[PDB]
Scaffold this motif. Structure first.
Motif, PDB file in Angstrom:
ATOM      1  N   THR A 124       3.694  15.051  32.063  1.00 39.68           N
ATOM      2  CA  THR A 124       2.828  14.504  31.015  1.00 39.68           C
ATOM      3  C   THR A 124       1.829  13.521  31.617  1.00 39.68           C
ATOM      4  O   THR A 124       0.800  13.203  31.010  1.00 39.68           O
ATOM      5  N   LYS A 125       2.141  13.062  32.827  1.00 40.08           N
ATOM      6  CA  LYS A 125       1.315  12.097  33.544  1.00 40.08           C
ATOM      7  C   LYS A 125       0.110  12.778  34.178  1.00 40.08           C
ATOM      8  O   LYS A 125      -0.973  12.799  33.600  1.00 40.08           O
ATOM      9  N   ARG A 155      -0.912  35.545  33.089  1.00 35.02           N
ATOM     10  CA  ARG A 155      -1.886  34.613  33.644  1.00 35.02           C
ATOM     11  C   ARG A 155      -2.442  35.166  34.946  1.00 35.02           C
ATOM     12  O   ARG A 155      -1.705  35.711  35.769  1.00 35.02           O
ATOM     13  N   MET A 175       8.581  27.317  20.258  1.00 33.74           N
ATOM     14  CA  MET A 175       7.929  26.095  20.707  1.00 33.74           C
ATOM     15  C   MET A 175       8.946  24.976  20.928  1.00 33.74           C
ATOM     16  O   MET A 175      10.026  24.969  20.328  1.00 33.74           O
ATOM     17  N   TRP A 176       8.590  24.039  21.800  1.00 41.68           N
ATOM     18  CA  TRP A 176       9.453  22.909  22.131  1.00 41.68           C
ATOM     19  C   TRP A 176       9.924  22.150  20.900  1.00 41.68           C
ATOM     20  O   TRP A 176      11.114  21.901  20.722  1.00 41.68           O
ATOM     21  N   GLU A 177       8.964  21.772  20.066  1.00 37.63           N
ATOM     22  CA  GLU A 177       9.213  21.011  18.857  1.00 37.63           C
ATOM     23  C   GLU A 177      10.371  21.482  17.970  1.00 37.63           C
ATOM     24  O   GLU A 177      10.929  20.693  17.204  1.00 37.63           O
TER      25      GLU A 177
HETATM   26  C1  LIG Z   1       5.258  26.598  25.553  1.00 35.34           C
HETATM   27  N1  LIG Z   1       4.133  25.718  25.180  1.00 35.34           N
HETATM   28  C2  LIG Z   1       2.882  25.535  25.776  1.00 35.34           C
HETATM   29  N2  LIG Z   1       1.912  24.599  25.227  1.00 35.34           N
HETATM   30  C3  LIG Z   1       0.613  24.238  25.632  1.00 35.34           C
HETATM   31  O1  LIG Z   1       0.115  25.257  26.552  1.00 35.34           O
HETATM   32  C4  LIG Z   1      -0.303  24.607  27.745  1.00 35.34           C
HETATM   33  C5  LIG Z   1      -0.373  25.715  28.861  1.00 35.34           C
HETATM   34  O2  LIG Z   1       1.061  26.030  29.026  1.00 35.34           O
HETATM   35  P1  LIG Z   1       1.616  27.512  29.381  1.00 35.34           P
HETATM   36  O3  LIG Z   1       3.162  27.512  29.463  1.00 35.34           O
HETATM   37  O4  LIG Z   1       1.093  28.671  28.457  1.00 35.34           O
HETATM   38  O5  LIG Z   1       1.475  27.461  30.794  1.00 35.34           O
HETATM   39  P2  LIG Z   1       0.072  27.985  31.580  1.00 35.34           P
HETATM   40  O6  LIG Z   1       0.387  29.116  32.575  1.00 35.34           O
HETATM   41  O7  LIG Z   1      -1.002  28.502  30.593  1.00 35.34           O
HETATM   42  O8  LIG Z   1      -0.600  27.302  32.471  1.00 35.34           O
HETATM   43  P3  LIG Z   1      -0.369  25.894  33.079  1.00 35.34           P
HETATM   44  O9  LIG Z   1       0.964  25.813  33.850  1.00 35.34           O
HETATM   45  O10 LIG Z   1      -1.439  25.651  34.017  1.00 35.34           O
HETATM   46  O11 LIG Z   1      -0.152  24.424  32.451  1.00 35.34           O
HETATM   47  C6  LIG Z   1       1.080  23.681  31.699  1.00 35.34           C
HETATM   48  C7  LIG Z   1       1.520  22.637  32.420  1.00 35.34           C
HETATM   49  O12 LIG Z   1       0.525  21.571  32.716  1.00 35.34           O
HETATM   50  C8  LIG Z   1       1.178  20.269  32.897  1.00 35.34           C
HETATM   51  N3  LIG Z   1       0.474  19.376  31.834  1.00 35.34           N
HETATM   52  C9  LIG Z   1      -0.020  19.571  30.544  1.00 35.34           C
HETATM   53  N4  LIG Z   1      -0.531  18.449  30.077  1.00 35.34           N
HETATM   54  C10 LIG Z   1      -0.427  17.343  31.052  1.00 35.34           C
HETATM   55  C11 LIG Z   1      -0.743  16.025  31.165  1.00 35.34           C
HETATM   56  N5  LIG Z   1      -1.325  15.338  30.243  1.00 35.34           N
HETATM   57  N6  LIG Z   1      -0.369  15.420  32.452  1.00 35.34           N
HETATM   58  C12 LIG Z   1       0.284  16.077  33.561  1.00 35.34           C
HETATM   59  N7  LIG Z   1       0.611  17.422  33.445  1.00 35.34           N
HETATM   60  C13 LIG Z   1       0.251  18.071  32.168  1.00 35.34           C
HETATM   61  C14 LIG Z   1       2.682  20.521  32.716  1.00 35.34           C
HETATM   62  O13 LIG Z   1       3.492  20.664  33.953  1.00 35.34           O
HETATM   63  C15 LIG Z   1       2.685  21.792  31.867  1.00 35.34           C
HETATM   64  O14 LIG Z   1       3.983  22.483  31.836  1.00 35.34           O
HETATM   65  C16 LIG Z   1       0.479  23.263  27.757  1.00 35.34           C
HETATM   66  O15 LIG Z   1      -0.016  22.244  28.633  1.00 35.34           O
HETATM   67  C17 LIG Z   1       0.468  22.865  26.305  1.00 35.34           C
HETATM   68  O16 LIG Z   1      -0.800  22.320  25.897  1.00 35.34           O
HETATM   69  C18 LIG Z   1       2.640  24.141  24.161  1.00 35.34           C
HETATM   70  N8  LIG Z   1       2.324  23.151  23.109  1.00 35.34           N
HETATM   71  C19 LIG Z   1       3.147  22.807  22.124  1.00 35.34           C
HETATM   72  N9  LIG Z   1       2.747  21.852  21.174  1.00 35.34           N
HETATM   73  N10 LIG Z   1       4.480  23.458  22.058  1.00 35.34           N
HETATM   74  C20 LIG Z   1       4.939  24.423  22.982  1.00 35.34           C
HETATM   75  O17 LIG Z   1       6.073  24.924  22.855  1.00 35.34           O
HETATM   76  C21 LIG Z   1       3.956  24.812  24.138  1.00 35.34           C
END
Ligand SMILES: C[n+]1cn([C@@H]2O[C@H](COP(=O)(O)OP(=O)(O)OP(=O)(O)OC[C@H]3O[C@@H](n4cnc5c(N)ncnc54)[C@H](O)[C@@H]3O)[C@@H](O)[C@H]2O)c2nc(N)[nH]c(=O)c21
Lengths: 20, 191
Positions: free
Chosen positions: B179-180, B131, B75-77
């Motif tokens: 994050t936006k 996915r 994880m990022w943290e």
């Molecule tokens: C690797 N990782 C993933 N998540 C969570 O999993 C989600 C899905 O992340 P995924 O890598 O498994 O990617 P996924 O294929 O499932 O699908 P998806 O790309 O659609 O979405 C992630 C992306 O959404 C965007 N996103 C998330 N939240 C926001 C926001 N508030 N505003 C704008 N963009 C956002 C970002 O570009 C982000 O990388 C993340 O949005 C986050 O909550 C994590 N949380 C923590 N706390 N630490 C982690 O290390 C972590």
């Protein structure tokens, strides 16, 4: 510098058999 | 005299690795769907583990597998990922049948085989994401500001995957994850 330590190449790891 | 090692001792790896499994639930904290499976520090123990688990391609979409160095949570943290980033391999629907599995295994080999020379010390781990909209595979490194080590890894990796060289891949720092709203995700390096 740094230390050598364990480095395996593809073939070897695959050679150690398992999932082809 | 003692017995001969090559005859009975296992093949030790550079580092001990840990395999983690993620299961979506979209109704629990991301961290709570993350679970450790087991660890290993030898080639044989690696295959023992690999041989008894589903191929990434056979997993329920929404799950991820993650192999990181013992002590580094996926994880990022984490202290070791906080300042890092990842080289991302974005696959298409079709590639789930033709490349996902082999690509992920090659990633695994690069990790445990320490296939990046001394730059393999900047490697944190790799993660595969199954996915429905398109699979992904990525190698995480500790410092996205370490261009030399980062560009080296990308090249070897891309070359190890054997995908058509005309296809470029980007490297992104975790700290810049949008994050936006979309906010456009971008790359620090490209190869
Ligand atoms: C690797 N990782 C993933 N998540 C969570 O999993 C989600 C899905 O992340 P995924 O890598 O498994 O990617 P996924 O294929 O499932 O699908 P998806 O790309 O659609 O979405 C992630 C992306 O959404 C965007 N996103 C998330 N939240 C926001 C926001 N508030 N505003 C704008 N963009 C956002 C970002 O570009 C982000 O990388 C993340 O949005 C986050 O909550 C994590 N949380 C923590 N706390 N630490 C982690 O290390 C972590």
């Amino acid at each position: 510098p740094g230390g050598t330590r364990i480095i395996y190449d593809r073939k070897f790891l695959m050679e150690c058999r398992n999932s082809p | 005299e003692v017995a001969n090692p090559e005859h009975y001792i296992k093949h030790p790896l550079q580092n001990r690795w840990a395999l983690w499994f993620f299961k979506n639930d979209k109704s629990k904290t991301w961290q709570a769907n993350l679970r450790l499976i087991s660890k290993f520090d030898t080639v044989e123990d690696f295959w023992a583990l690999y041989n008894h688990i589903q191929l990434s391609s056979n997993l329920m979409p929404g799950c991820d597998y993650s192999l990181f160095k013992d002590g580094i949570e996926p994880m990022w943290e984490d202290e070791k990922n906080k300042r890092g980033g990842r080289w991302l391999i974005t696959l298409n629907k079709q590639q789930r049948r033709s490349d996902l599995d082999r690509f992920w295994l090659e990633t695994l080999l690069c990790l445990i085989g320490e296939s990046f020379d001394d730059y393999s010390d900047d490697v944190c781990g790799a993660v595969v994401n199954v996915r429905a909209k398109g699979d992904k595979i990525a190698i995480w490194t500790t410092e996205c500001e370490n261009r030399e080590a980062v560009t080296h890894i990308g090249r070897v990796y891309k070359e190890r995957l054997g995908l058509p060289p005309k296809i470029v891949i980007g490297y992104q720092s975790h700290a810049d994850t949008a994050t936006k709203s979309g906010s456009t995700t971008k790359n620090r390096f490209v190869v």
